[model samples]
Target: GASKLRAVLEKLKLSRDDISTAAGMVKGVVDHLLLRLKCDSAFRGVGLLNTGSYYEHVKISAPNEFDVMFKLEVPRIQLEEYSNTRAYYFVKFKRNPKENPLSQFLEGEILSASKMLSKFRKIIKEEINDIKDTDVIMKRGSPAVTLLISEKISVDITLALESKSSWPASTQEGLRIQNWLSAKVRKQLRLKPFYLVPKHAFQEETWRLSFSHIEKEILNNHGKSKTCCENKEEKCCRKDCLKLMKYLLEQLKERFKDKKHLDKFSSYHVKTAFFHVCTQNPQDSQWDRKDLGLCFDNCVTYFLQCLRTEKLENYFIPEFNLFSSNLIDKRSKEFLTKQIEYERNNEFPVFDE
Candidate 1:
C-alpha cells in the first residue's frame, strides 16, 4: 500500500529557493534592527538570538513568522518563585546599584517586567519611525514587539534578560529525558542560562521562563544515536513526523475554524506530545526514516490519548497542563478527539487538500 503520509509530506515540503529568499529578507530586517539597537545608548550590549518553529526548521509551509530575542545581561539577581504554579518568577537585584540602564524600570526592590516591555515597545516604534515598508503590529498584553514587513512577513522580538547559569529549583523535576537524552546531556543543558521574557500573570509583574533553546536542541537531535539525522543510513523521521502532524493540524484548523463546536489548538500542544513520545520510544531504530508512516501514526495516537485524557503536560514543567488552560474545554476536547479519530480513520481528507 502506498504511504498516504509520505504523499502529504511531499506537498508539505517547502521550496529550497523560498527558504533562502525568505530567510535573506528576514535576516536583513533583523540585522538592521540589531545595528540600530547597538547604536542606542541603552541597548548597546544586547545580543541577538533566534528561536521558534520557523528557525527550528519544522515549520510546514512558506516561512512567515520569526522569533528573535534581544538578550540583556543582568548582574547578581534573586528569583522570587510563584508558590502555586512554580512556573513564573519575579526578579530582584541583590542590592540597590548606583547606576544601571534598567534602574528606572525597577520598582522598590523588584524589576518591573511589564514596565520594561512598554518602554521596549515604545523604543521599537521610535527606532522604526523613519523606516520604510514596515509597520508595528499592535496587540494588548502581548510580550513581543511584533513587526509586519511589507504586510506579508511578520517578526516577533522579545526583550529577554539573562542572569545566573543555575536554573530555578522549580524545574529540578523538569526535563525528564534520562532514558532518551542521557544525564550528561541534561546536565550540560542546565549549564546554559535560561532567558526571561516580559510576560505577566495574575496582574502581577512577572517574567516567564523560556526553554526555546533547549527545545530546539532536543528536536534537532531526537534519537539515541549520536548520528541521528547526520548520515543517510541513520537518518530519523521524528522531525518529519512532527512536521506532518503540524501540517495536518493546520489543515484541520483552517477546515474547521468556523465550525460551531470546534476549539482551536496550538502547535505547542503537538510539540509537547512529540517530546514525551520521544522519551517513551527513545531509539533511532523505532523512528527509522523508512518507516515514517508508523512513527507518525504513533505520534498521532499519543496526541489522541492526551486529548482523550485532556492532560497534555508541558515538557519542561510537567505540572503545567496545556489542555486545562483557558483556550480549552472538556467538551471541545471530546469533540476534537472524535474529529481527529474520524479524520485519521478516514485517511485524512483535509490533508488531501
Candidate 2:
C-alpha cells in the first residue's frame, strides 16, 4: 500500500509553472463572472472550488456552440490523506429554467475573460427585458440563471453554497477535484469508490456554526428548553457526554495522524456531533462563536501541515499534494481549466496566482 501510495503521490504533483498559470487563468474567469454578476441583479449565482484541478463536463448546444452553460460540482479538499478512491469532491449547478428562469433569457455566463466582458453589457439588457415582459418567456437554449441574493431576500442561501467564494472559475477547480481524489484513493484505497456524498452532508460545519443564531431565535420566541441538560440532577446527559468525549479522544489519538486508515472510522455523525458539542458555549449554554472560529482555523492549519509533510516525504504523489494544498489555500479555478486545456487544445495559460 505504501509503495503504491508513493507512486500515486509522484504522479499528482503540479509544476510551479503549472500552479502559477492555473491561478492566473482562473482569476481571469472569476473577474469576468464577477463583472457579469455585478451588472445583472438577477445573476445571483457564484462559483467555487478554485484549486485548479477539477473537471467540468460542459454540454455544447447542437449547432452554434455559441450558447454554452454548465453543471458543476467541486469536491472540498481535505489534506488528511484520504481520497475518493471510494468518494469524490464536487460543486454542482443544475442550470435550467425552473431553477433559474433568468438563465434562459440572459444568454450564457462568460467563461473566457474576453467573451465575458463583451457579454457583460448585454446581461443587463436581458434582465431588464425579463422584468418588462408581462409573461415569462422561455427562449430555446437560453441559460437559466439563479443568482442567490442576500438574507434579506426571498432565498435562504445558508446551505446554497458549501464554501467560501462562489465565483465562475470554481468549476475548473471542481473538475480537478475528482482527479485529486483519484490520486489520493490510489495511495490509500487503491481504487476509486463509487459512492459520493451529497452537498448537504458536506455542509455540516456551516450548519453547526449557525447554531448560535438559531438558539437566540428560539430564546426570543420564549421557547427555550425547560432544563439545561448539563445542569440536570439525574446526570443522564452529562454521563453520556463524558463517555462520548472519552471515545472521541481515543479515536483522535489513534487515527489523527494516519491519513488513510483513520477515515475508516464509522463515527462520522457521532464525531461531528461531539465536535459541535465541544464547540457550544458552556457559559451561556449555547453554541460558541469563538469555538466555531477556532475549529475552522484548525481545519485549515492541519490541512496545510499534512500537505507539506507529504511533499517532504513523497508519501503521496506531488500532484495529490499540489491539488490538495492548492485547495486548502483556496486556489483551484485556473488549475482545473488548465487541465481542460490540455485535453481540448493541448495548451496552458501563461501566468501566476
Candidate 3:
C-alpha cells in the first residue's frame, strides 16, 4: 500500500515549471481584472480571498485551475432561514437597499444574490472583453465566471459578500474543533467575517455561508505541534493522506464516469471526512510520515463509515449534511459504499494506471 501510495503521489504533483508558469499566468490575469474592477463604482471595495483545494495545497490535479473569491464589502446584515436545512439564507440589510452599493440587486428588503451574481458576471465579462484577449473565452457558469485561458488553464471566480456580523445562529452548534484546534482558534475565526456565496434556491435569491478561508487555514496548520513537517524528522503526512484520498476518488470516477451516483461524490466530500478523522486523531504520531499507508487507511475507513451511515456533515456548518438524500440519492449512497469497499478490500485496483 505504501509503495503504491508513494508512486501515485509522485504522479499527482505539479512539476516546478508547471507550478511557476501557471501561477504567473493566473496572477497576471487576475491582477489586470482586479485593477479594472478597482475603478468600478460598486466593485471598488472588492478584495481577493483565495480558496479551494488548490490553495489548501492538497490539489492532486494539474496547476492550471484556481479558485478565487471576489469579496464584496457589505454592511452589517440580517439572515433569514431560506430553507429547513439551515444551510441557505436570505441576507437582509438594516438600511434601505437603495442606499448601498448593492441597492440595485436587492429583492424586496433582502439582497438578491442571483441579481448580484448576474451583475458581477456582467462586470467581469465587460472588463475582460475590453482587453479582447483571443486566448481566453468567458463562460457565465452561474455562481462562478469561468475564464478558459487557453486549453491548459482556467480560473473559476466566485463573488461572495463579506459580512462583519456574527455567523448565523444555525452554525452555533457547528465548527466543533475545540479538542483538535482549541477554543481560542475557533473564537478568532468566528470573529473574522464569513463570506456568503451566491446559491439561488429555486426563484429565491439565497446565499450559502462559506468557510473556505477557514478550511485552508486548518489544512495549512494541521499538526498538533507547530513544528510538524518543518524538520527532517517528526514529519506529518496529513496533506499527503488527503491527496491520496482525492486521487482514489478521481481514479474511481474516471473509471466509472458512466455511473451517476459515483459522479456525485466530490473531492470536498473527501476533504470534509478527512478533517473529521484528523480531529479524532490529532496527534502527529497518528499521522507520521512513515505511516502514510496507515493514515490513508484511517481516512478511507472514516469515509466508509460516513458513506455507510449516509451522512457527512460540512466541516464548518455541521447542520449541512453533504450526504443527504437530495444531494446523493439513497441508491447512489449505497452504490458508493459498495464501490469504495470493493476498492479498499481489493488493494485499490482502480489506482493503477
At residue 174, candidate 1 shows an lDDT of: 82
* Model 2: per-residue Cα lDDT over 25-132, one tens digit each: 333333444455544443444332221121221111111111112212223312111232212233222343244323332323311212232343356335435554
Span of 10 residues, lowest total lDDT, candidate 2: 151-160
lDDT by residue for model 1 (1-353), tens: 12777877776565556655565566676667777777766667777754545543222232465556777787777888865666678888877656777787788888887787776777677667757555444333344676766676666677878875688876888888888889989898888888887776667778878776677677877778888778888888888888877776776766676775554576768888888888898877888888887787788899999999889887777777778845488888898899789877776776664
> All candidates' TM-scores?
0.89, 0.20, 0.91
Number of clashes recorded per candidate:
0, 48, 0
Give the clashing residue pairs of candidate 3, or none: none
- The C-alpha stretches of model 2 lying farther than 4 A from their native spots are 14-16, 44-353
Ranking by lDDT: 3, 1, 2
Better model by lDDT: candidate 2 vs candidate 3: 3
On TM-score, the leading prediction is 3
lDDT of 3 by residue, 184-244 (tens): 8878889988888887656567788887778777887778777777788868999999888
Error of 2 at 173 (Å): 29
lDDT of each structure? 0.73, 0.27, 0.78
- Candidate 2 lands at a TM-score of 0.20
